[PDB]
Structures are given as C-alpha cells and as structure tokens.
Design a protein around this ligand. Structure first.
Ligand SMILES: Nc1ncnc2c1ncn2[C@@H]1O[C@H](COP(=O)(O)OP(=O)(O)O)[C@@H](O)[C@H]1O
Ligand SMILES: Nc1ncnc2c1ncn2[C@@H]1O[C@H](COP(=O)(O)OP(=O)(O)O)[C@@H](O)[C@H]1O
Lengths: 520, 77, 519
C-alpha cells in the first residue's frame, strides 16, 4: 500500500546523500567546539530566544527531519551520560570520518570494508591513549587536585564568575553519595535544582533532601535536633482536604459547630504529637495561626504547604513513611534525621527546608542560585560536566592531556600502523588519522588562527621537538604543552568519544536505502 | 594503480599490497603484466634506467610549479 | 463511444511476462544487500515518521507491502517461508528473481513460458535429489559431545565481531540458554535484556524472567526477597497515594465532613489493598507504579511488592509461572496467581533484578548483556539471535549441508553437466537454472566487500576438481571448506528454499495476462 511516491535511491548516490546530511550536522557544530566556540541562536517553538554553544543543547533543539541526522542526535543522547564534555567532538569526528569516506567510495571501496578499517584503527587509537595517560589520585584519596582540574573546564561556561565555589561543591557531593575506595559513583543520586535570586556564589550542597518550604511559624526552632519526623497528608488541626476547600457555609447552626471543632481538635491533634512523640511534623497542607500557638510552647517544629510529590521525596531520603490518616499514626512510621534546619538567604526570606543526616548520606542535591534564569540553566549544564568529569576521574584515575594533543598522537600511531595492514582497509586507516585531526584543526580555526599551520606545527613538535604529546593553545596563553596549562580530559572520555563516533559511522555506512511511502 | 588496472588486477589492492611489501622489502616488488600479478621484478629482468624516473619527477614538478604560478592569462594583440 | 475495455486495463503476451520479471527484480534489490550476517541494513519509515532499522529480509518485506501484482506473489511466498521456518526468505526471494532474469532473454526470443516451467520443475527435483545424496548427518562425529560442536557453530556467527576476544564466554551462553529449554524450542521464548556499562564477560544468563526493576519507592528492610512457593500476582493496578486511578475529591463547608472524606479516601484504597491480602498473593507486582503508602501496608502485613514491571516481562513470567494478568484487583484469586520454585533478588551491576527460577511452566529464560555502549550490545543482540537459531537448528535436523553458497555451486555443477546430456530446449534452461544459483555466493562476496569474480572463479574451479563443501568465507577474502569450518545449514530447509523459489517463479512465468475490474 502507498507504493506511489515511495522513496527509492541506492548505491553511491544514496551513501553520498546520507554523508551529505551528517556533514551538515557536523559543520553546524564544528564552529561551536571549544571555549572559543561560536554560539548558536536557538528560537523555541513558543517564541523564546536563547544563545549558547553547548553541543548537547544544540542537538536537542536541532529538529532535523532527515533520518540519518536523527541517528546522530540519538548517539549524543547516550554520550551525555558517559563522556559529558566532548559531545561536539563525537559529531565533529563522525562528520570528518564520513567526509574522508567519500574520497574512498570514489576509489571503489565498499562501505562495510571502510567500517572494518575504522574499527581496526579505533582499537589502535584506544590502545595508544592508555600509553600516553597519567594518573592524579593513584593510591590515595585526595581532594585538592580534584577541585583544581574540574575548575578549569567550568571556567568556559557562565559559572566563570564563581567557578571556584562550584568545584568544591561537586567534590563533596560525589564524595558523599559514593566512596572513593569502591570507585562506583551513581550520577542518578546527584540531583540538580535551582531558583532565581541571589548569585552563583550562593549555590549549596544539601547532604540529604531539600524542598523550598518554610516552617509553620517563624518562631519555630531554626534547628531541629530530635529524630522524630511525622509525615502526614493532613495537618494536625481540624482536617481539610488536599485538593480544594470551597468554603460555602449554609447557616449559623453549622458555623458555630465549626468553632467547637477548633478548640476540640486543635488540642487533640497537637496532643497526638506528644502521645507519639513527633517533633518535625511534615504535612501537605499548612497550619493555621491557632496550631502555631500550641506548637511554639512545646517547641514542636512543623512544615507547611508541602506539595504532592514533595512529600515522597523526604520519606525516601529520611527513610520515613507517609501517614495519610491520623488513625494510622505510630512511632515506626516516623522519619529519621540528624539535624533539620532553616536556611534564610539573607534579606531574601526563602526559608528552604533542609533535612540533613549529619553525615555522608546516599542522597545529595546541588541547588544553583542566580540572578538570571538564562545564566542558571547554562550553569546547571556546566556543573553537569563536572559531575561526569569527577565520576570518570574516580572510576579511572588515568587521564590524557586535552587541547587536541591526544587526537594528534593517535593520528601518528594510526598512520604508522596503517602500513602494517595489507588489505583495502589501509586506505581507511589513513583516513581515520586525518579525521582525528579535525578536532584540533577545529579549535585552531575557532581561535582565529591558521588551522593547518597550527596543526602540523604541533605534530612536528610531537616528533622533532619532543616525544611527549603537546596540544594547541586555543586560549592564547603562553604556549603549547597543555600539561603546563592544566587542561586534561578523562581517559574514559576520549575512549568513548572516538568509539561512539566510529560506531555511528559504521551504522551510517551500513545503510544504503531509506524507504518511506508517500501520500497519494 | 594504472598498471594494475591495465593488467586486469584491482587498482587498490595491488598498490595497497605493494605498499606493505615495500615497507617490509625493497623496490624489487612491482607489477608484472607478463604473468598477471605481483612478482619480484628484479627476477623478471624488467628494469629501467634512473634518469627516466628522475627526469620525470624533475620536469613534471617544474611544470606543476609553473602552472600553479599562473594567476591569470591576458589576451594581447 | 462503444468500446470493450472502458477502463478495463489489460495487456497480454510476452510484454506482460517481461513486465512482471522486472517488477520481481525490484523486490530482490530491496533485499539483495541484506544477504548474510554482515549484510547492509535498511532504513524504513512508517507514516508517523517512526524509523525502523533492520537487516532481516523477512522484516523488510512485511513493512514494504508493494502494490504490484507480481511482487505480491514473492512477498506472500516469502512470508509463508518466514512463518514456517523464519529463515531463508532472502534466498527464496533472490533465487526466484534470478530464475526469472536468466530466462528473460529466452522469453524475448519467442520461447514459450510453459517450456520454461518444465525446466524448473525438472531441475528442482534433480537438485533436491542431489542434496539428499550429498548431505551428511552429524550427531556424534569424532566422539565429541554435542555441547562442544554447537559451541563451534555459535562462535562461527560471532567470529570477527565486537566480542571476538571474549566469544568463548558468549558462545557458552547460547548453548546454555538453548539447553535450558524443553523439547519445544522457540526463539521468542529466550528473551534478552541490555545493561549499559561493565565488561563484556559480565553478561549474565538468568534462568527465568529478568527486568531492570526501576521500582525505587520506599519498602527497604522489609519485603523478604526469598520465597519457596509464593503465590505470584500479576496486575495493572496503580496503588499510589497521589494516583489518578485511586483518589477522592469532595468539596463542602462542614469541616466535620472532611474528617470522613480524607478517611474515606484511604478506606477505598484499603478495600483494594485488603483484597490483595485476602487473595493470598505473596510476590505482588503490577505494571503501573505503586506508592510509598501501599508499600507500608505490604510491610506491615509481611508481603512482597515490586511494581513498574513491563508488560512483556510480566507476560513472559505469565507463560513461565502459568498465572494470568488481571487488571482489576477484585478478581485476584488462585485462578490467576502463579507459582515458582526459587525466587531471589540479585545485584547484577549494582541494580536489583528480580527473577523467578524453576517455574512450573519454565520454558523461557533471559540473557542480560553487558558492554561499554548500546552498539556493543545491539550488534551483539543481532548475532546472538541467529546463534540461538543455529544451535536450535543443528539439534532438530541432523542432516545438513555446507553453507556460504557451497551447496549452490555443487548443484550448478550437477545441473550444468546434466543439461548437456538433455537434448532439447531444456538444455539452455537447466543451465540457466544453474547460473541462477550463483547469486547466493555472489552477493555474499559483494555485500562483504570482496571481489566476486576472483572468488567465484576460484570457487567454481575447486568444485570441478572434486570440491563439494567449499564456499564463501565472509571473514577472510578467500574460499574455505564451510563443512570443516562448521558453517552448516539444514538440508530440508534448503530443499524448501529451492522448491518455493521455483514454485514462485513458475507462478510468474505461467502468467501471461493481467485482468483488472474497473473500481
Ligand atoms: N582550556 C582549554 N584549553 C585548550 N583546549 C580546551 C580547553 N577547554 C576545552 N578545550 C578543548 O575543547 C574541546 C571541547 O571541549 P568542551 O567544550 O568541554 O566539549 P564540547 O565542545 O563538546 O562541549 C575539547 O576537545 C578540548 O580539547
Ligand atoms: N558464517 C557464515 N559464513 C558464510 N556464509 C554464511 C554465514 N552465515 C550465514 N551465511 C550465509 O548467508 C545466507 C543467508 O543467511 P540467513 O540470513 O540466515 O538467511 P536469509 O538471508 O534468507 O534471512 C545463507 O545462504 C548462508 O549460506
């Protein structure tokens, strides 16, 4: 059915057409590579306007209707969870490998043979990266250089104004949820949130759970020491529903009875706090001024106007249980915490609920403040790089020098080993070397320098001047040798960068027919 | 690759195989059209003088350098 | 004014047959590059824009649904081959179009279609007789255990792949998963799940059903993870507190009435929770999420609970345990409740994976993969599914022949040498039938990036000197004894491919006119 107007194209004309689409996605992002990358003006469907150079955000907003380009976006969706930093490096490298592959199709190479050639060269590159790697925190748990390296990458984003305070926060979070000995960090437990107001320096790390809610009365204890956290759906007062009140009195005989239920239940409900021994009373709907009177004399802290899902978030962290009705009240369902406090952000009366365990718990969240919503969001993704950076640093202390030093060193090894490949993949191995050089060649172009002259000069220095790898000085600092500049990327980052790029090239090279039925 | 094409061989696999034989061996490895495949040319007694290969690169490169230096052509009268 | 057709489009004779021959080659071209394990993929887009990537010939033809009359004949023939066998649709599709291509110039030269049918019906029976005479039975060759030979056939498909360095481990996982099943073997029963990260050797093989278990609600330090004979409950109920399926909303002024509304709101959920308790369910599970409040009820009453289970995993456990997935909790009883022998909650890769081992109807299992990315697992997923079929085929049918087009070249030698002794018009046709068998070893070379000329000429020369099992090697660009290399296929499955191919070509050749009611 619907064979009319069906897509029909195969052979080299189809592969070159597929390669043409991937190059457009790469060339669009090749300029946004590095700290000197050119931003991209994104207009949302709702009419908003945003500007950034994040490779991940560019691909999420880039709604390319071509199918080959969609696979390039699906690839980057997984990279954000593994590498974090070089999302543009994967797409830029894939476009380079496909562009060089087009020269091979004219020579008469099969796409599957090029796929085997890149897989062989990708193993040579991954083997070479471990040789030129270096450790940081080997055989010792240290916090000083772990703050230093993560601080360098953050300096490019909008967190540059207070970049130092963010790096120390990302260390205590991962150090809290995960142990450096086991070296198995869980990025899912490290949440992220924020609110407009204050400045970037006001970002904090909550060892526990945080919900932007205040006490039922300002005279409540600013620090709750007792570990008796009663969580309910209704407040300890004459009960009201969770959805809507809709007060419509009928007559006075009913109204005067409501006054009786006040004195009857305000004392009885708050007496239940003493019968069971609860101290911090968390509840969906808030308290009236009457219950605040009884709560203050006995030093009974309590939260007010907590949301639907906000209730469950505290029970998971504190290990408590929800008491949806007062008949189900008991001592076993009460939460547990070391100390709960109220953080009043200076002149701004935020008064956020801060339930802490007084130790390194298995749940943390970094609340990013800021005077501009556009700077907070770009700062939220800036910190996201530090997490995956610190995650890979702990999972593997081995790291390699960034700035394109690794790509140039890998290209030399692949070029030498290509001579030892007596088969048609020899032309493909050479193409992998030239494609690796596009990442450093792109940083030189984006910095306003001659790409080729800067490319070959660094490569000759990696052989003639000295054997250790040397990078490109994109920030116009003193000189090359990024080891002095302290610009170092994770070994797991580069290994997955060229691996995901090769896997996408093989997946695209092994497709020669995009069939779609047309509307007749 | 042009010699391999004329000899019925694959233009790529012929030069791709010979580039490994030259990395490991010497210049004796070359295309033998009499037998239809790669063979040790030193044994086949198929040689040429050195001036042919040297004068070819010398005169060809000078022509390429000359053609590269042409910025434009002017029609006189 | 007065015409005979009046919209009835009809053409007859040689032009109609030649039109159907060319239309059949279009279906061949759609599945020509997918022949073999290393065949190129095909991207298909439905009406909604959803993409579909797959190198399976059967799955491609189902999504096309070509409207040409002659093309539908091959598709329905190939679809029947998929339902009966599930493999060989591409070989049947390619051979049929190739039988039609080789007899194309003879049809144009005035040769009758019926004379061509006598050649296919004759050459087919001679080929089927040659397969059984040359085929070989392998049950206990070399006094080697079947577990070891099947390991060789499994790693053969997995050779020179992304898991080539550790295929010894992966090879055993295929033989183990197949041997776990009963006499009735099927590919759908043995499921597979993907788990990103970790070494390739860490791929686990659960004997029962397994799933990610994204359920991270409260309920820890309770709900014992071990049961001897639990009454497993499978539902689709949402027992969440802040649930859209179970909630109450009443708005009045009397605060005394809110004392009943907020309490009756929970009493409704308690009547549904108590119905689960009275039913005797021990290991309760549901597709929809379950809240923290409900888990406390399961904890206070010493009951297990694990929600957010996919329906496929639940239905896979349904056929394994033998229960029933009941939507409403009111009909939950012993009729729908399942059973199992040993249940345990493990720690595969840090996350918890529930699984019931030794179920009463345990005809299924699950294989959890591990790797550095999805493409390591997806590429591994494709090769293992055929590895299960290879092991599943060798045990069923002991008579096999050399794959990789080795049998196709032997028949080409027999039929071609036989055609010379057959005087008449059958000579050119039986020989044309022989050359059509060259496409199977040819496209395996073209799709693998090899030179089909150098291989086919070197391959056809080996069969003349005495070769009978030599064929195409997708790994090394050279010929190899596919029998010694344990590249086997069932002889009866290959016999049904030639029969369906000739029967499909005969239907197209026997047709001379197309008729179309104007509608
Ligand atoms: N301070 C720096 N000095 C030199 N090169 C850098 C520096 N920071 C980043 N780079 C280079 O820029 C490239 C992209 O970095 P980054 O912006 O973190 O990833 P992406 O561009 O994918 O978002 C990396 O390959 C890295 O080598
Ligand atoms: N490891 C192998 N080596 C050589 N040939 C193979 C190998 N595996 C499969 N083949 C060949 O690929 C062809 C197609 O196999 P398969 O995909 O199972 O059937 P279909 O292509 O009809 O779906 C078969 O004719 C077989 O000879």
């Amino acid at each position: 059915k619907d064979q009319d107007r069906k897509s029909r194209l195969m052979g080299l004309e189809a592969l070159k057409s597929h390669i043409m689409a991937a190059k457009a996605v790469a060339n669009t992002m090749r300029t946004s590579l590095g700290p000197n990358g050119l931003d991209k003006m994104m207009v949302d469907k709702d009419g908003d306007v945003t500007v950034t150079n994040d490779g991940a955000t560019i691909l999420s907003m880039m709604d390319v209707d071509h199918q080959i380009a969609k696979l390039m976006v699906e690839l980057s969706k997984s990279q954000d969870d593994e590498i974090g930093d070089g999302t543009t490096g994967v797409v830029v490298l894939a476009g380079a490998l496909l562009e060089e592959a087009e020269q091979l199709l004219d020579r008469g190479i099969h796409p599957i043979r090029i796929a085997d050639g890149y897989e062989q060269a990708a193993r040579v590159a991954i083997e070479h990266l471990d040789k030129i790697s270096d450790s940081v925190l080997v055989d010792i748990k240290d916090t000083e250089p772990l703050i230093q390296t993560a601080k360098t990458t953050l300096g490019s984003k909008v967190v540059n104004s207070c970049h130092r305070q963010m790096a120390e926060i990302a260390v205590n979070a991962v150090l809290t949820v995960a142990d450096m000995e086991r070296r198995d960090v869980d990025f899912e437990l490290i949440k992220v949130e924020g609110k407009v107001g204050g400045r970037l320096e006001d970002t904090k790390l909550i060892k526990g759970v945080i919900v932007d809610k205040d006490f039922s009365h300002p005279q409540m204890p600013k620090k709750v020491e007792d570990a008796k956290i009663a969580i309910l759906t209704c407040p300890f007062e004459p009960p009201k529903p969770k959805t809507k009140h809709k007060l419509d009195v009928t007559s006075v005989e009913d109204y005067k009875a409501l006054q009786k239920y006040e004195k009857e239940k305000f004392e009885e409900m708050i007496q239940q706090i003493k019968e069971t021994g609860a101290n911090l009373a968390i509840c969906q709907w808030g308290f009236d001024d009457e219950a605040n009177h009884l709560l203050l004399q006995n030093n009974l802290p309590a939260v007010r106007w907590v949301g639907g899902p906000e209730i469950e978030l505290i029970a998971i962290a504190t290990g408590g249980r929800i008491v949806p009705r007062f008949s189900e009240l008991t001592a076993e369902k009460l939460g547990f915490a070391g100390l709960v406090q109220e953080i009043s952000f200076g002149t701004t009366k935020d008064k956020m609920l801060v339930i802490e365990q007084c130790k390194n718990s298995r749940a943390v969240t970094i609340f990013i403040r800021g005077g501009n919503k556009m700077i907070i969001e770009e700062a939220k993704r800036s910190l996201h790089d530090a997490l995956c950076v610190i995650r890979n640093l702990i999972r593997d202390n081995r790291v390699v020098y960034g700035g394109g030093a690794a790509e140039i060193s890998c290209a030399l090894a692949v070029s030498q080993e290509a001579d030892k490949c007596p088969t048609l993949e020899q032309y493909a191995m050479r193409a992998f070397a030239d494609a690796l050089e596009v990442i450093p060649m792109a940083l030189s172009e984006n910095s306003g320098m001659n790409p080729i002259q800067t490319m070959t000069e660094v490569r000759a220095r990696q052989v003639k001047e000295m054997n250790p790898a040397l990078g490109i000085d994109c920030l116009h600092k003193g000189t090359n040798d990024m080891k002095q500049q302290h610009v170092i990327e994770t070994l797991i980052g580069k290994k997955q960068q060229i691996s995901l790029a090769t896997q996408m090239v093989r997946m695209i090279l092994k497709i020669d027919d995009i069939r779609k039925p047309g509307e007749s | 690759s042009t010699l391999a094409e004329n000899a019925g061989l694959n233009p790529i696999s012929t030069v791709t195989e010979l580039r490994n034989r030259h990395a490991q061996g010497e210049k004796t490895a070359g295309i033998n059209v009499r037998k239809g495949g790669i063979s040790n040319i030193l044994e086949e007694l198929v040689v040429q003088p050195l001036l042919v290969s040297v004068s070819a690169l010398t005169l060809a490169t000078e022509t390429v350098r000359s053609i590269l230096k042409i910025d434009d052509v002017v029609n006189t009268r | 004014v007065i015409l005979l057709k009046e919209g009835t489009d009809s053409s007859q004779g040689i032009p109609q047959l030649v039109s159907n021959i060319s239309a059949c080659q279009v279906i061949a071209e759609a599945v020509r590059t997918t022949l073999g394990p290393r065949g190129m993929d095909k991207l298909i887009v439905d009406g909604r824009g959803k993409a579909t990537i797959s190198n399976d010939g059967a799955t491609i033809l189902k999504l096309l649904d070509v409207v040409h009359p002659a093309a539908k004949t091959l598709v329905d023939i190939a679809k029947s081959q998929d339902a009966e066998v599930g493999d060989g649709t591409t070989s049947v599709t390619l051979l049929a179009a190739e039988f039609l291509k080789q007899v194309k110039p003879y049809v144009e030269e005035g040769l009758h279609p019926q004379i061509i049918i006598r050649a296919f019906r004759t050459a087919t029976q001679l080929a089927v007789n040659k397969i059984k005479e040359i085929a070989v039975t392998v049950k206990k060759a070399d006094k080697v255990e079947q577990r070891k030979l099947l390991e060789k056939c499994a790693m053969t498909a997995l050779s020179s792949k992304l898991i080539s360095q550790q295929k010894a481990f992966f090879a055993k996982m295929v033989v183990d998963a197949v041997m776990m099943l009963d006499d009735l073997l099927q590919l759908k029963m043995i499921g597979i799940k993907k788990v990103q990260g970790g070494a390739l050797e860490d791929s686990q093989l659960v004997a029962g059903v397994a799933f990610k278990k994204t359920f991270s609600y409260a309920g820890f330090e309770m709900q014992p993870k071990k049961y001897h004979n639990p009454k497993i409950a499978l539902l689709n109920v949402e027992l969440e507190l802040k649930a859209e399926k179970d909630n109450a909303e009443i708005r009045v002024h009397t605060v005394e009435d809110y004392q009943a509304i907020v309490d009756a709101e929970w009493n409704i959920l308690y009547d549904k929770l108590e119905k689960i308790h009275h039913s005797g369910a021990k290991v309760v599970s549901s597709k929809l999420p379950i809240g923290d409040v409900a888990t406390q009820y399961f904890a206070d009453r010493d009951m297990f609970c694990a929600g957010r289970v996919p329906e496929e995993d639940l239905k896979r456990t349904m056929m394994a345990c033998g229960g029933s997935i009941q939507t409403s909790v009111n009909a939950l009883s012993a009729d729908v409740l399942g059973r199992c022998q040993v249940f345990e909650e493990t720690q595969i890769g840090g996350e918890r994976y529930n699984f019931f081992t030794g179920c009463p109807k345990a005809k299924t299992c699950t294989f959890i993969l591990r790797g550095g990315a999805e493409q390591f697992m997806e590429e591994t997923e494709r090769s293992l599914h055929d590895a299960i079929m290879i092991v599943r085929r060798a045990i069923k049918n002991d008579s096999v022949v050399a794959g990789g087009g080795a049998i196709e070249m032997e028949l080409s030698k027999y039929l071609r040498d036989y055609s010379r002794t057959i005087p008449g018009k059958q000579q050119l046709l039986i020989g044309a039938y022989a050359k059509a068998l060259e496409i199977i070893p040819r496209q395996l070379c073209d799709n693998a990036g090899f030179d089909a000329t150098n291989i086919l000429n070197k391959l056809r020369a080996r069969h003349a000197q005495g070769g009978t099992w030599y064929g195409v090697d997708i790994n090394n660009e050279d010929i190899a004894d596919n029998f010694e290399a344990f590249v086997w296929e069932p002889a009866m499955v290959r016999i049904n491919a030639l029969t369906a191919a000739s029967e499909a070509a005969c239907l197209i050749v026997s047709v001379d006119e197309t008729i179309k009611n104007p509608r």
